[PDB]
Design a protein around this ligand. Structure first.
Ligand SMILES: CCOc1cc(OC(C)C)c(F)c([C@@H](Nc2ccc(C(=N)N)cc2)c2nc(-c3ccccc3)c[nH]2)c1
Ligand SMILES: [Ca+2]
Lengths: 254, 55
C-alpha cells in the first residue's frame, strides 16, 4: 500500500495473509469461518499446492502475539473464464482445511447480495484497500498491515482520466478503477488478492479485490480491482458445494 | 422501491407485487420491527469491528 497508514491492530479483522513455503504470497478476505476470497493471479506460479497457508488475525510480520491463526488451504477455486497471465476474471475462492475461530481479531467481511452491491455499494465513493505490499513502487513491503481510503470511478471516467499507455489491458465489466492519478496513493502488487471494503450504514462489505495496475501509484494511473458483485452467485453456489479431491478446482463461470 | 435509497433498508432489499418492499439481513443478523434495521444475533457478525464496537 502506497500513501496509506498502519491499520490499527484489529481494525482490518477480515484481512488474510497468504503464504507459500512461509513466504508472503498475497492478501485475501475472510467472508465466513471457512472461506477466503483472493485473486486468481496469486496462484499462476504455484507448484507446491500443499504448502499454501492462510493466516488470520495477522498484524505485524516481525512478531507472534498469539492472535494469529494459521490454516492450510484445502481448495483453490478459479472461474473457467480466467486465463493465467491475463487480467480478466481475477478472483479465487479458497476453502480452509479447518474453520478459523472468530475473535476480536478475526472477523469475516460481509459478502453482499449482487443487487445491493450493484445498486447501492457501487455508489459509495470511498472504500478501504489493505495489505502488507510495497510501501513504494520498487520499494520494500510493509511489516505492519497498511490501509488506504480510495475513491471509486466509473470506467468511462477512469479511461478518460488515464494516460494512454500502449498494449494496456482493457478494463472489463469484471473490473473497476479506484484510487488517485497524482502518483501519491495506491495498492501495490504485494497487496494482490486483498480486500476493497465498503462501509454502508454501520457495516462493511466486500466490493473489490486488489488485482492490477500500471506500476504502483504511477502518475496518470489508477488501481484496478475485480468487481466482486459479478461473482456473488458463482461464490454462493460454490460455498454450498461439497469439497472435491485435489487443491486446484476450475469451476464454470457463469 | 429498492433502486431508490436501498428502499430505506439498512442491508438487503426485495421488491414485491405493487408498492410492496421487504428488507432482509445477512446471516448473523435479524430484522427489527421497523422492517428496515438489522441487529446482530451472534457475537461476531460480519462487517463489524469488535474493538471499535466495544469502544
Ligand atoms: C490479473 C493480474 O494482472 C496483473 C497485471 C499487471 O500489469 C499489467 C499492466 C500487465 C500487474 F503488474 C500485476 C501485479 N499486480 C498489481 C496489483 C495492483 C496494482 C496497483 N497499482 N493497484 C498493480 C499491480 C502483479 N502481481 C503479481 C503477483 C502477486 C502475487 C503473487 C503472484 C504474482 C504479479 N504481477 C497483475
Ligand atoms: Ca504477528
Amino acid at each position: 500500500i502506497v500513501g496509506g497508514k498502519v491499520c490499527p491492530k484489529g481494525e482490518c479483522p477480515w484481512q488474510v495473509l497468504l503464504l507459500v513455503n512461509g513466504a508472503q504470497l498475497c492478501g485475501g478476505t475472510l467472508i465466513n469461518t471457512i472461506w477466503v476470497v483472493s485473486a486468481a493471479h496469486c496462484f499462476d506460479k504455484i507448484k507446491n499446492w500443499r504448502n499454501l497457508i492462510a493466516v488470520l488475525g495477522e498484524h505485524d510480520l516481525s512478531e507472534h502475539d498469539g492472535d494469529e491463526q494459521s490454516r492450510r488451504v484445502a481448495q483453490v477455486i478459479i472461474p473457467s473464464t480466467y486465463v493465467p497471465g491475463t487480467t480478466n476474471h481475477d478472483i479465487a475462492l479458497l476453502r480452509l482445511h479447518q474453520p478459523v475461530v472468530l475473535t476480536d481479531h478475526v472477523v469475516p467481511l460481509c459478502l453482499p447480495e449482487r443487487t445491493f452491491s450493484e445498486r447501492t455499494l457501487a455508489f459509495v465513493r470511498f472504500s478501504l484497500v489493505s495489505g502488507w505490499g510495497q510501501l513504494l513502487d520498487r520499494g520494500a513491503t510493509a511489516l505492519e498491515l497498511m490501509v488506504l481510503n480510495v475513491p471509486r470511478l466509473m470506467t468511462q471516467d477512469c479511461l478518460q482520466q488515464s494516460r494512454k499507455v500502449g498494449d494496456s489491458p482493457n478494463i472489463t465489466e469484471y473490473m473497476f478503477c479506484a484510487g488517485y492519478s497524482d502518483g501519491s496513493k495506491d495498492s501495490c502488487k504485494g497487496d494482490s488478492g486483498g480486500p476493497h471494503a465498503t462501509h454502508y450504514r454501520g457495516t462493511w462489505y466486500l466490493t473489490g479485490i486488489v488485482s492490477w495496475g500500471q506500476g504502483c501509484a504511477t502518475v496518470g494511473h489508477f488501481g484496478v480491482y475485480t468487481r466482486v458483485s459479478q461473482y456473488i452467485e458463482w461464490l454462493q453456489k460454490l460455498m454450498r458445494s461439497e469439497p472435491r479431491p485435489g487443491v486446484l478446482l476450475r469451476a464454470p463461470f457463469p | 422501491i429498492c433502486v431508490n435509497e436501498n428502499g430505506g433498508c439498512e442491508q438487503y432489499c426485495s421488491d414485491h407485487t405493487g408498492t410492496k418492499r421487504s428488507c432482509r439481513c445477512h446471516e448473523g443478523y435479524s430484522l427489527l420491527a421497523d422492517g428496515v434495521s438489522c441487529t446482530p444475533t451472534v457475537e461476531y457478525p460480519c462487517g463489524k469491528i469488535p474493538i471499535l464496537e466495544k469502544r
